[PDB]
Amino acid sequence: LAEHLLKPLPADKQIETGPFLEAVSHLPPFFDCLGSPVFTPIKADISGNITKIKAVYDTNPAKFRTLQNILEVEKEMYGAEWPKVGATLALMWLKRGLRFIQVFLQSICDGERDENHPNLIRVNATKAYEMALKKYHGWIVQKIFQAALYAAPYKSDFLKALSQNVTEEECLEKIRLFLVNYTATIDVIYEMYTQMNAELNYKV
Ligand SMILES: CCCCCCCC
């Protein structure tokens, strides 16, 4: 995780699109290592949105230099169909997948656990779902999440998968390092959606 740190935010809190997409493109591969085919469509969603954004960027890298540039250009370019269109829509869902990973990792690092089932990560995933995704899912998808929860690896196994021959404590310290700029970046993205009134709450 800490081999592909996100850059700190610059003083003007503008996120450059190219470096951002390069950075987060390192996350979907972690889903191949969780030991379940349940993760294949999850990986496709997150990668699919990165791809959607990268393809808008590639048409005009200068015009789409920053994530802010994307939202403002698309607002102008699309009129009434915006923000439910283009790279704006893909980023709206990408941020929520990114926020999920953030809350989950942070929960693990903060030592939140089920006292009764200490080596499970179900409480951490459940928190992350509630905070990042749940309100945008209808009852069917929520039910699928409840089923998929059972495919979670054991905590000890998860951390081992993210790690070199390194202790669990060492692994978590590196996860903490990653979370600094990751969290900061996602926060700026969420703030941007709020300022631009680009957030939608439709359920799927
Ligand atoms: C620089 C972004 C590349 C697009 C990859 C989509 C899969 C994670």
51 CB under 6 A from ligand 1? yes
Does a structural domain hold residue 107?
yes
Measure the CA–CA gap between 29 and 43, rounded to whole angstroms.
8
Question: SS3 for 203?
Answer: coil
CA–centroid distance, residue 79 to ligand 1 (Å): 27
Which residue from 86, 101, 181 is spatially nearest to 133, judged by alpha carbons?
A: 101
Residue 51 assigned to a binding site: yes
Does a structural domain hold residue 6?
no
Give the CA count within 13 Å in the CB-facing half-sphere of 68.
10
Does a structural domain hold residue 7?
no
User: How many residues would you count in the chain?
Assistant: 204
Pocket test for ligand 1, best of 47, 53, 93 (most atoms within 8 A of CB): 47
Ligand 1 atom closest to 46 (CA) = 8
Residue 52 assigned to a binding site: yes
Expressed in Å, this structure's resolution amounts to: 1.9
Task: Give CA angle at 182 (118, 134), nearest 5°.
Answer: 60
Pair of tokens at residue 115: 């006292």
Does a structural domain hold residue 129?
yes
Ligand 1 atom closest to 27 (CA) = 8
Does a structural domain hold residue 52?
yes
Does a structural domain hold residue 67?
yes
Residue 101 assigned to a binding site: no
Residue 47 assigned to a binding site: yes
Determine contact, residues 179/109, Cβ cutoff 8 Å. yes
Which residue from 148, 153, 156, 160 is spatially nearest to 39, judged by alpha carbons?
A: 148
Question: SS3 for 196?
Answer: coil
Measure the CA–CA gap between 41 and 43, rounded to whole angstroms.
5
Which residue from 193, 169, 189, 183 is spatially nearest to 104, judged by alpha carbons?
A: 183
Place of tokens 């990165």: 50
Does a structural domain hold residue 1?
no
- Using CA atoms, how far residue 19 sits from 89, 111, 201, in Å, is 20, 31, 28
Sign of the CA dihedral with 39 first, then 130, 107, and 66 last = positive
Question: SS3 for 167?
Answer: coil
Determine contact, residues 75/193, Cβ cutoff 8 Å. no
133 CB under 6 A from ligand 1? no
Measure the CA–CA gap between 90 and 80, rounded to whole angstroms.
17
CA–centroid distance, residue 25 to ligand 1 (Å): 5
Does a structural domain hold residue 65?
yes
Listed in sequence order, the residues at least 6 apart from 79 whose beta carbon sits closer than 8 Å to its beta carbon are none
Query: What CATH number did the domain enclosing 69 receive?
Result: 1.10.3520.10
| Residue 120, domain extent | 14-196
Structural domains of the chain, count: 1
Measure the CA–CA gap between 145 and 134, rounded to whole angstroms.
9
Sign of the CA dihedral with 184 first, then 188, 189, and 193 last = positive
Helix axes 168-195, 155-162, angle to 10 degrees: 80
3-state secondary structure 40-58: HHHHHHHHHHHHHHHHHHH
Pair of tokens at residue 181: 């700029």
Give the CA count within 13 Å in the CB-facing half-sphere of 20.
31
Q: What pairs with residue 179 in β-bridges?
A: none
Measure the CA–CA gap between 152 and 146, rounded to whole angstroms.
11
Residue 138 assigned to a binding site: no
Ligand 1 atom closest to 25 (CA) = 8
42 CB under 6 A from ligand 1? no
